[PDB]
CSV table of C-alpha atoms and ligand atoms in Angstrom, one decimal:
chain,number,residue,atom,x,y,z
A,294,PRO,CA,2.9,26.4,2.3
A,295,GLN,CA,4.2,23.3,0.4
A,296,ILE,CA,6.1,20.8,2.5
A,297,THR,CA,8.1,17.7,1.6
A,298,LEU,CA,7.9,14.5,3.8
A,299,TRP,CA,11.5,13.9,4.6
A,300,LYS,CA,10.7,14.9,8.1
A,301,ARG,CA,7.4,14.7,10.1
A,302,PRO,CA,4.9,17.4,8.8
A,303,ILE,CA,4.6,19.0,12.2
A,304,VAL,CA,2.8,22.5,12.5
A,305,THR,CA,2.0,24.9,15.2
A,306,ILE,CA,-1.6,25.0,16.6
A,307,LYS,CA,-3.4,27.3,19.0
A,308,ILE,CA,-6.5,26.1,20.7
A,309,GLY,CA,-8.2,27.3,23.7
A,310,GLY,CA,-5.4,30.0,24.2
A,311,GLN,CA,-2.8,27.2,24.5
A,312,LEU,CA,0.0,26.6,21.9
A,313,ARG,CA,1.0,23.1,20.8
A,314,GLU,CA,2.6,21.3,17.8
A,315,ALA,CA,0.7,18.6,15.9
A,316,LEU,CA,1.4,16.2,13.0
A,317,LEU,CA,-0.6,16.8,9.7
A,318,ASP,CA,-1.8,13.2,9.3
A,319,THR,CA,-3.6,12.3,6.0
A,320,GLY,CA,-4.1,8.8,7.5
A,321,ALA,CA,-6.2,10.2,10.3
A,322,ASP,CA,-10.0,10.8,9.7
A,323,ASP,CA,-10.2,12.9,12.8
A,324,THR,CA,-8.0,15.3,14.9
A,325,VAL,CA,-6.7,13.9,18.2
A,326,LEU,CA,-4.8,15.9,20.9
A,327,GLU,CA,-3.5,14.7,24.2
A,328,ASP,CA,-1.8,17.6,25.9
A,329,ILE,CA,-4.8,20.0,26.1
A,330,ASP,CA,-7.7,20.6,28.4
A,331,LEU,CA,-10.8,22.0,26.5
A,332,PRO,CA,-13.9,23.6,28.4
A,333,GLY,CA,-17.5,22.7,28.0
A,334,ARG,CA,-19.6,19.6,27.3
A,335,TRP,CA,-18.2,16.6,25.3
A,336,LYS,CA,-19.3,13.1,24.3
A,337,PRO,CA,-17.3,9.8,25.1
A,338,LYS,CA,-15.9,8.1,22.0
A,339,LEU,CA,-13.6,5.1,21.3
A,340,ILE,CA,-11.1,5.4,18.4
A,341,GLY,CA,-9.1,2.6,16.8
A,342,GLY,CA,-5.5,2.9,15.6
A,343,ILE,CA,-2.5,0.4,15.3
A,344,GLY,CA,-2.4,-1.6,18.5
A,345,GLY,CA,-6.0,-1.2,19.6
A,346,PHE,CA,-8.3,1.5,21.0
A,347,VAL,CA,-8.5,4.6,23.2
A,348,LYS,CA,-11.3,6.3,25.0
A,349,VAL,CA,-11.5,10.0,23.8
A,350,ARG,CA,-13.6,13.0,24.7
A,351,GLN,CA,-15.2,14.5,21.6
A,352,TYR,CA,-15.5,18.3,21.6
A,353,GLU,CA,-17.5,20.0,18.8
A,354,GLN,CA,-17.2,23.4,17.2
A,355,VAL,CA,-13.8,24.0,18.7
A,356,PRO,CA,-12.1,27.1,17.4
A,357,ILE,CA,-8.4,26.1,16.4
A,358,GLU,CA,-5.7,27.9,14.5
A,359,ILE,CA,-3.5,25.5,12.4
A,360,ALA,CA,-0.4,27.0,10.8
A,361,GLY,CA,-2.1,30.4,11.0
A,362,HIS,CA,-5.5,29.4,9.6
A,363,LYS,CA,-8.5,29.8,11.9
A,364,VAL,CA,-11.0,26.9,11.5
A,365,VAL,CA,-13.7,25.4,13.8
A,366,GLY,CA,-14.4,21.8,14.0
A,367,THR,CA,-14.3,18.6,16.0
A,368,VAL,CA,-11.4,17.9,18.3
A,369,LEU,CA,-11.0,14.7,20.1
A,370,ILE,CA,-9.0,14.7,23.4
A,371,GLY,CA,-7.4,11.6,24.7
A,372,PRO,CA,-4.1,9.5,24.8
A,373,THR,CA,-2.1,9.6,21.6
A,374,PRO,CA,1.7,9.4,21.3
A,375,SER,CA,1.5,12.4,19.0
A,376,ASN,CA,-1.0,15.2,18.6
A,377,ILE,CA,-2.5,14.7,15.1
A,378,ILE,CA,-4.5,17.0,12.8
A,379,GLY,CA,-6.8,14.8,10.7
A,380,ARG,CA,-8.6,15.2,7.4
A,381,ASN,CA,-11.7,16.8,9.3
A,382,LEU,CA,-9.7,20.0,9.8
A,383,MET,CA,-7.1,19.6,6.8
A,384,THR,CA,-10.1,19.8,4.4
A,385,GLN,CA,-10.8,23.3,5.9
A,386,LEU,CA,-7.3,24.3,5.0
A,387,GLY,CA,-7.9,23.2,1.3
A,388,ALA,CA,-4.8,20.8,1.9
A,389,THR,CA,-3.8,18.5,-1.0
A,390,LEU,CA,-1.3,15.7,-1.4
A,391,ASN,CA,0.8,16.0,-4.6
A,392,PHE,CA,2.9,13.4,-6.3
B,183,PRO,CA,-1.7,13.5,-9.3
B,184,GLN,CA,-3.0,16.1,-6.8
B,185,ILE,CA,-5.7,14.9,-4.4
B,186,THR,CA,-7.9,16.6,-1.9
B,187,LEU,CA,-8.7,15.1,1.5
B,188,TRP,CA,-12.4,14.9,1.6
B,189,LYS,CA,-12.1,11.1,1.3
B,190,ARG,CA,-9.3,8.9,2.4
B,191,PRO,CA,-6.2,9.1,0.1
B,192,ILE,CA,-6.3,5.5,-0.9
B,193,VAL,CA,-4.1,4.3,-3.9
B,194,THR,CA,-3.4,1.0,-5.7
B,195,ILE,CA,-0.2,-0.8,-4.9
B,196,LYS,CA,1.5,-3.8,-6.5
B,197,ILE,CA,4.0,-5.8,-4.4
B,198,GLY,CA,5.3,-9.2,-4.8
B,199,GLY,CA,2.9,-9.7,-7.9
B,200,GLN,CA,-0.2,-8.9,-5.5
B,201,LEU,CA,-2.5,-6.0,-6.0
B,202,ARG,CA,-3.8,-4.2,-2.9
B,203,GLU,CA,-5.0,-0.8,-1.8
B,204,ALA,CA,-3.3,1.4,0.8
B,205,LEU,CA,-3.7,4.7,2.5
B,206,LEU,CA,-1.2,7.5,1.8
B,207,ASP,CA,-0.4,8.4,5.4
B,208,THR,CA,1.7,11.5,6.2
B,209,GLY,CA,1.4,10.6,9.9
B,210,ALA,CA,3.2,7.3,9.5
B,211,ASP,CA,7.0,7.2,9.4
B,212,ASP,CA,7.0,3.7,7.9
B,213,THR,CA,4.9,1.6,5.5
B,214,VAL,CA,2.8,-1.2,7.1
B,215,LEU,CA,0.8,-3.8,5.1
B,216,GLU,CA,-1.3,-6.7,6.6
B,217,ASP,CA,-2.9,-8.6,3.8
B,218,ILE,CA,0.3,-9.7,1.9
B,219,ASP,CA,2.9,-12.4,2.5
B,220,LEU,CA,6.5,-11.5,1.3
B,221,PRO,CA,9.4,-13.9,0.5
B,222,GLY,CA,12.8,-14.0,2.1
B,223,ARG,CA,14.5,-13.0,5.4
B,224,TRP,CA,13.1,-10.4,7.7
B,225,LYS,CA,13.7,-8.8,11.2
B,226,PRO,CA,11.1,-8.7,14.1
B,227,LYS,CA,10.1,-5.1,14.9
B,228,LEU,CA,7.5,-3.6,17.3
B,229,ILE,CA,5.6,-0.5,16.1
B,230,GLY,CA,3.6,1.9,18.2
B,231,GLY,CA,0.4,3.6,17.3
B,232,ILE,CA,-2.5,5.4,18.9
B,233,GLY,CA,-3.8,2.2,20.6
B,234,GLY,CA,-0.6,0.4,21.7
B,235,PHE,CA,2.0,-1.8,20.0
B,236,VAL,CA,2.1,-4.5,17.3
B,237,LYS,CA,4.8,-7.1,16.3
B,238,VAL,CA,5.9,-6.6,12.5
B,239,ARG,CA,8.1,-8.3,10.1
B,240,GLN,CA,10.5,-5.8,8.5
B,241,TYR,CA,11.4,-6.7,4.9
B,242,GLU,CA,14.1,-4.6,3.3
B,243,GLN,CA,14.6,-3.5,-0.4
B,244,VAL,CA,11.1,-4.6,-1.4
B,245,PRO,CA,10.2,-3.6,-4.9
B,246,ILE,CA,6.7,-1.9,-4.8
B,247,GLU,CA,4.6,0.1,-7.2
B,248,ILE,CA,2.6,2.8,-5.7
B,249,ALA,CA,-0.1,4.6,-7.9
B,250,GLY,CA,2.2,3.5,-10.9
B,251,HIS,CA,5.6,4.6,-9.5
B,252,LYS,CA,8.1,1.8,-9.0
B,253,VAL,CA,10.1,2.3,-5.8
B,254,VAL,CA,12.2,0.0,-3.6
B,255,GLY,CA,12.2,0.3,0.2
B,256,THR,CA,11.4,-1.1,3.5
B,257,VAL,CA,7.9,-2.7,4.0
B,258,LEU,CA,6.6,-3.8,7.4
B,259,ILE,CA,4.2,-6.7,7.5
B,260,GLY,CA,1.9,-7.1,10.5
B,261,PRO,CA,-1.7,-6.4,11.9
B,262,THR,CA,-3.0,-3.0,10.9
B,263,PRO,CA,-6.6,-2.1,10.4
B,264,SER,CA,-5.5,-0.4,7.1
B,265,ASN,CA,-2.6,-0.9,4.7
B,266,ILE,CA,-0.6,2.4,5.1
B,267,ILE,CA,2.1,3.9,2.8
B,268,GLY,CA,4.4,6.0,5.2
B,269,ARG,CA,6.8,8.8,4.6
B,270,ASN,CA,9.7,6.3,3.9
B,271,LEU,CA,8.0,5.5,0.5
B,272,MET,CA,6.1,8.8,-0.2
B,273,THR,CA,9.5,10.7,-0.2
B,274,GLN,CA,10.5,8.4,-3.2
B,275,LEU,CA,7.4,9.8,-5.0
B,276,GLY,CA,8.4,13.4,-4.3
B,277,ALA,CA,5.1,13.7,-2.5
B,278,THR,CA,4.2,17.2,-0.9
B,279,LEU,CA,1.4,18.4,1.3
B,280,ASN,CA,0.0,21.8,0.1
B,281,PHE,CA,-2.2,24.3,1.9
C,1017,478,C1,-5.0,3.8,9.8
C,1017,478,C2,-4.3,4.2,11.2
C,1017,478,C3,-3.0,3.7,11.2
C,1017,478,C4,-4.5,5.6,11.3
C,1017,478,N1,-3.7,6.4,12.4
C,1017,478,C5,-3.0,7.5,11.9
C,1017,478,C6,-1.5,7.3,11.6
C,1017,478,O1,-1.0,8.4,10.8
C,1017,478,C7,-0.6,7.2,12.9
C,1017,478,C8,-0.5,8.5,13.7
C,1017,478,C9,0.4,8.3,14.8
C,1017,478,C10,1.5,9.2,15.1
C,1017,478,C11,2.3,9.0,16.1
C,1017,478,C12,2.2,8.0,17.0
C,1017,478,C13,1.1,7.1,16.8
C,1017,478,C14,0.3,7.3,15.7
C,1017,478,N2,0.7,6.6,12.5
C,1017,478,C15,1.1,5.5,13.0
C,1017,478,O2,0.5,4.6,13.5
C,1017,478,O3,2.4,5.3,12.6
C,1017,478,C16,3.1,4.1,12.8
C,1017,478,C17,2.7,3.1,11.8
C,1017,478,C18,4.0,2.9,10.9
C,1017,478,O4,4.7,4.2,11.1
C,1017,478,C19,4.5,4.4,12.5
C,1017,478,S1,-4.3,6.5,13.9
C,1017,478,O5,-3.3,7.4,14.6
C,1017,478,O6,-4.5,5.2,14.4
C,1017,478,C20,-5.9,7.4,13.9
C,1017,478,C21,-7.0,6.7,13.6
C,1017,478,C22,-8.2,7.4,13.7
C,1017,478,C23,-8.3,8.7,13.8
C,1017,478,N3,-9.5,9.4,14.0
C,1017,478,C24,-7.1,9.4,14.2
C,1017,478,C25,-5.9,8.7,14.2
């Protein structure tokens, strides 16, 4: 698809058999989800945004479906006011910004 | 232009006779710049990001050039680890996300 930016670029995701929504976020290097429990081993990691920093669980080689496209990559789990898909996964969709 | 997302989508801006760089940020509703002082009246505003909240100055009807395109709109000034161009201004470029 091609979408305009008059509203937030929210898409449907499926991860670990759970369905959620997430914001396509060209400002975010990495994907961050709050409302999802993932199984298996993880690494503690601190991410920085506007206002300060949050402790996140880093999960690697996570299968995730984004707007219908199966990819596998790194998903961070921790507090975020919005689930965000970052460039780590948007590059696997071949996503582009156009203006 | 069309850009891919293997690197951060950074563009050159000109605002108030000052040249800066900023991130094209589909995850950001509003534009936020740190490293620039703007003239005239403003309104206090609090914005929320991943890591809490910051106090910003809201400046309205600010002339700004983004990757060569003159627009006028609202610019928030306050602490941000990266200057960000949000959807408020990217909609004036006719920007789209494609995948
Ligand atoms: C340069 C920063 C700002 C990058 N952030 C992404 C931005 O899109 C961020 C995403 C977000 C959406 C909803 C609520 C809160 C935050 N929008 C944001 O703060 O919107 C504010 C600023 C004005 O408009 C509102 S991040 O979330 O800190 C981040 C950082 C690192 C990683 N790996 C992942 C995410």
